[PDB]
Design a protein around this ligand. Structure first.
Ligand code: ANP
Ligand code: ANP
Ligand code: ANP
Ligand code: MG
Ligand code: MG
Ligand code: MG
Lengths: 404, 403, 402, 249
DNA sequence: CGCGCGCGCGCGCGC
DNA sequence: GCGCGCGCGCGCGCG
């Protein structure tokens, strides 16, 4: 563990009444205020602007890692993860030691008449699942990292020895194998938790069945509240024997041990989720969260969200000949070269900053944007010309590129 | 061993006379009375409307797991399970006591005397089997262990040193291999019965030959009353003739040990029980129960079942500006979207409450319903398009669906 | 090995990180490329020597003659930024941070604060792609770039050994078990160990041996991985071509070791299948190295002129002439047509032919003779570039259209 | 049969105090062939010299000098891989193999180093695949190696139930354990006379061996096998390190 | 501590 | 190009 002792404050939900695993997480935040906490930026003083060439380049190449502007779509994502984690613990409440008294009293009072029936079972799996699908570059990995960074990963409960783990992030196996997802599970858990599960069960020549049972044993021992699997699109194309095997193992994981599972991938992963009704409505239990590139124009006016995003990005420059205000003439060159894909915007900005910084004419203009677009982004050209064209036939040539 | 102390109360069935494992069970109930006791709803007070938005949203998200209304398809299933649990104990009663002198007298009056024929071994495997197949979302698991939770999971006798496991629910194996199904059996047993069978019998490199032997021995020791294997559709994975091995293991388990077995799956498992007459005959050894999406109009008059279901669901709204009664216009487009699937009719309601709650217009209308249908319930559309068309060629493209 | 010393850098975010301060100091781009200059030292006494000795000392020119071009200013900065940014997320920060976590936890749970951020640790790895023609010097250039940094550094304060770069290559049929054996071989060649013997000969699956690769690469914290010749992933059949890229994409996602991929334009189309195979194949841009053109504009290009003038000085002939005629240089580019390796080999073979013929003079006729006689399997593809035809050049995937 | 090494040097800058070079006889259309083979042997021996002494003193002195002093940069790992590979094209009955065997007959095949635990072999001539596959040329490597020197890799790794995978790593390991000066190969027609989609995989192995292992290889064939040296410039450029030698009467 | 048995996986050949 | 059959090696359990 990292030894975060647990402190118990009750919340306003009747279904979370006196649950030790629920009342140990940061309290229920409002929708607007929760997405405000995700706001991050890179700060630079006036002294850092009067620095030499190499230090400025090295500290300006840090923007993609630390700059982050929340979006309106995060208002919907944060609500789901709030109830996924908290809701899955409802059925996994450690029962009071006085449970047998109630059972025996009910049994003796139903046996002799005077009571029609009695519920002899309380524990039942509550866990569910969802599926967020978006084009590559939609900023889903970083968004999930920054949302989950608010939660403490592993805590400790003093009264009874459970070393609760809230979440752990893994990725799908490169060949779609099921006996490799367990090695990633062990590696991620013995990195996040303080243990050596990779040594004990990793190099031993156990079978597929006798190590899946081991992963299921670690997860119910330290209650896991969410397991997130990324790069699901690897199940597509060259899957070894099949993908339905891994899918229905995850289904068993959701239904039996009550650990909610969240799946992440590109819309190349819709080809594995539409073959029958079961593999679709069970693939997403809170529905899907389909993310799309941001558009320059709203229903009847330019999109203000992109305006705020572009302005806040444009404020972060280390060029001495910078222009404080941002014109529409050079703003419109961004969208005609980026099409709203959130990665290309920041990468083009950083690459243009480096080019201007090193060309000797440290002024950013519309010309440098296309000048650096035409050399340093060549292997991604044809996938964005299709988005520029807007014709569905040219868009549908690529599986990741979702038709509008 | 939760140590529920057994109490013996007599019943009215002649064949269930002085059975230790039948008299110590919940008493016989009428199916109409039994189905009425599955009713449940979310507990809401009037003051819950004046609460924080987040708390109200979290309260709404608990609807899918607490609201449950019994339909007309629960009478038959309740009756079948109530007979199937309790008919398998006639051929396993350890009430046999001093059976030496009676057999000796019979032998010594058959070897010489007027008795042409006497019968000695009256033990029989009285078990049966069921096959419950329905659409993915009809409520097989929920209704199954809401019905089956009126029975105590484990009952203990001390006059006879036996621990009785009345039922045990296990899922199938992901790859259709008998090696994984015993690990699930042991985990379910030691997760319900307090014990440690998983480490003792599961991580040693025992072959498949002896692990099944240990499983049979343990199931016979604890007089298991019902084994329910869920997700039986997983056997379509083993297309190298590996489903026959798993099927005949359960057939053997019914013929000798005597535990009744229940099979549950989507209609994609219908390709399993059609290779020969034996599979189909024993797949439904006491009938088969097939479920379908609930229909809006059974006849010219509207169906009262769906009307009652949707009216009872409509009263669980924490939106403040709520309509007093459920309008016919929004009701007719409620079926038009879910098409009778019991999971989607509730998920649409929950997600529309969450959408109107976040948007600020705390009221449910048809337009918002279709907005939520298009935006968020996206991957399930082609199957619902096929169900909306009504033509057989569209439906005969997905294996899960039944015409 | 190297015993670490700690010198602070100018960057505010590269501060207190042991794996960054141990590296050489941040240098400017002008002196980074200028310091990467090599030549062979000669004396006037070598004029009177034997033919065999002269031939053996002039055959060494391609090995130790390196004049930086104008493109190296970008490559040096790119590699330095990648190496120093790889270690940003891989910094030991669990020194006394436990009390900070507990204080923040009790402040968020009970007090007035809400927006605490546990576990600032993450991955900051980005990928680079270098695609150029076979002869553009994309291998010896990278060798000279990373010859500046020490291979492995031993840090005394904690028993951790750091290796900053590792050089492997894709081989044969684009299988992952190629690169596990290659990875172990390179790692235990650079750092004296027996990793290949401990893990190679054993009967091990692909997915179990990749985990050992990941574990050992995370033990000796690796700041860069170079996979040269990724053109072997193109003609290779089955589902291995996409799965090797899958492995390299997930290597820069969890472990954090940045990956740089080097190939020829034959492997230009291994990425063009999808969007994710292209964005995740060039993180900080992709560098395409075109061959030297005769004129950058209406005026002649000074890069080629400087190259020829500096390369001309490395001659050892009795009747040698320091000056060179314009006719000599004009046919020099005509025969080779932009590809630098062919230039240096044509020069050295012409010098060898002149030395052994008995005529101690270099002339354009001898250059044409050594072009025709020796470079027989090289010219049928140089003809397309010499003729300047778009389709003739576009016949092959080895050479880009312009 | 192995002979002791007599280290006699000559007035050359590149070859100096490197035991793998001065353990060879004195340096002083067949003239070009002999000169080319000699220079590849010695240049390939250059890039693998373990003649270094107290590197750690020098390396740490340079590190400390760069970290604080006025010296710009220090060039760590001055260890290259000097390998070159020509193509030899000529008809089978012309007599190319006669000159080949005459030139490689001049130098001793295997020599002995006593101060170092290395017994390097100057040349190692295997024949190309008769059926045509990746495996048999590497088995041929074991057979030629154990014919050259008293060895038993034919039993340990020749017919051992391994794959096409681990055999290659062992072959490279035993190649650079006794560093080869030349890997000369004849009859390259059957490389692509028959195939299974893997005609260029053997050339991929050759390129990898002349990149990391650092052994200069030689390829010999009749004008039939020129098809693979025409498809793309990577194979065409690497197919002629010092330039191809087409044989004429 | 040595030998016997079984099981898991890897490679080659056949369809 | 994929599935099945065989063979090889390793590990644990018992006397
Ligand atoms: N909300 C955001 N604000 C600013 N930059 C962002 C945001 N989201 C993503 N980025 C940038 O997007 C780049 C990488 O996006 P990333 O999150 O890796 O894509 P991804 O879809 O989540 N993973 P992948 O499957 O490879 O596309 C980085 O440069 C981030 O700075
Ligand atoms: N009578 C009912 N009243 C209320 N909700 C119901 C009813 N029947 C089913 N549901 C809901 O339908 C959803 C599906 O439940 P579930 O138990 O998964 O059925 P299922 O058929 O086993 N799904 P699957 O295992 O994939 O076939 C749940 O959200 C239940 O709450
Ligand atoms: N800057 C340079 N100045 C002089 N010669 C150079 C230079 N760069 C490369 N060369 C020549 O190129 C040789 C090595 O580069 P080269 O073999 O072409 O690598 P590469 O072909 O680009 N990488 P690859 O084709 O994937 O193996 C050197 O020995 C030189 O002869
Ligand atoms: Mg991602
Ligand atoms: Mg179910
Ligand atoms: Mg190279």
């Amino acid at each position: 563990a990292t030894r975060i002792q647990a402190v118990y404050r009750d919340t306003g939900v009747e279904a979370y009444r006196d649950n030790p695993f629920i009342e140990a997480l940061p309290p229920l935040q409002e929708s607007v205020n929760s997405a405000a906490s995700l706001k991050s930026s890179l700060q630079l003083t006036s002294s850092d602007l009067q620095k030499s060439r190499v230090i400025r380049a090295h500290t300006i190449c840090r923007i993609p890692d630390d700059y982050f502007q929340p979006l309106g779509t995060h208002l919907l994502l944060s609500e789901r993860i709030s109830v996924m984690i908290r809701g899955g613990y409802v059925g996994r409440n450690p029962k009071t030691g006085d449970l047998q008294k109630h059972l025996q009293n009910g049994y003796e009072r139903v046996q002799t008449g005077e009571l029609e029936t009695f519920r002899f079972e309380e524990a039942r799996s509550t866990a569910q699942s969802l599926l967020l699908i978006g084009c590559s570059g939609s900023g889903k990995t970083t968004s999930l990292h920054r949302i989950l960074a608010t939660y403490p990963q592993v805590i400790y409960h003093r009264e009874l020895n459970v070393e609760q783990v809230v979440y752990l992030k893994i990725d799908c196996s490169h060949n779609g194998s099921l006996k490799e997802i367990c090695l990633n599970f062990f590696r991620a858990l013995d990195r996040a938790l303080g243990s050596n599960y990779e040594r004990r069960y990793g190099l031993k020549r156990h079978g597929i069945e006798t190590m899946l049972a081991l992963m299921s044993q670690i997860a119910n021992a330290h209650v896991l509240g969410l397991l997130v699997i990324d790069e699901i699109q690897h199940l597509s194309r060259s899957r070894s024997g099949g993908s339905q095997e891994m899918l229905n193992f995850f289904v068993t994981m959701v239904n039996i041990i009550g650990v909610p599972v969240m799946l992440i991938g590109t819309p190349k992963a819709r080809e594995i989720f539409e073959a029958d009704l079961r593999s679709a409505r069970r693939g997403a239990g809170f529905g899907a969260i389909f993310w799309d590139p941001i558009q320059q124009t709203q229903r009847g006016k330019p999109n203000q969200e992109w305006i705020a995003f572009t302005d806040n990005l444009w404020q972060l420059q280390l060029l001495q000949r910078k222009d404080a205000l941002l014109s529409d003439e050079v703003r419109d060159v961004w969208y005609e070269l980026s099409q709203g894909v959130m990665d290309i915007v920041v990468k083009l900005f950083v690459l243009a900053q480096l080019r201007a910084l090193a060309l000797g004419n440290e002024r950013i203009t519309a010309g440098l944007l296309r000048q650096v677009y035409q050399d340093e982004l060549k292997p991604v050209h044809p996938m964005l010309e299709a988005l520029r064209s807007g014709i569905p036939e040219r868009i549908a040539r690529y599986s990741d590129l979702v038709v509008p």
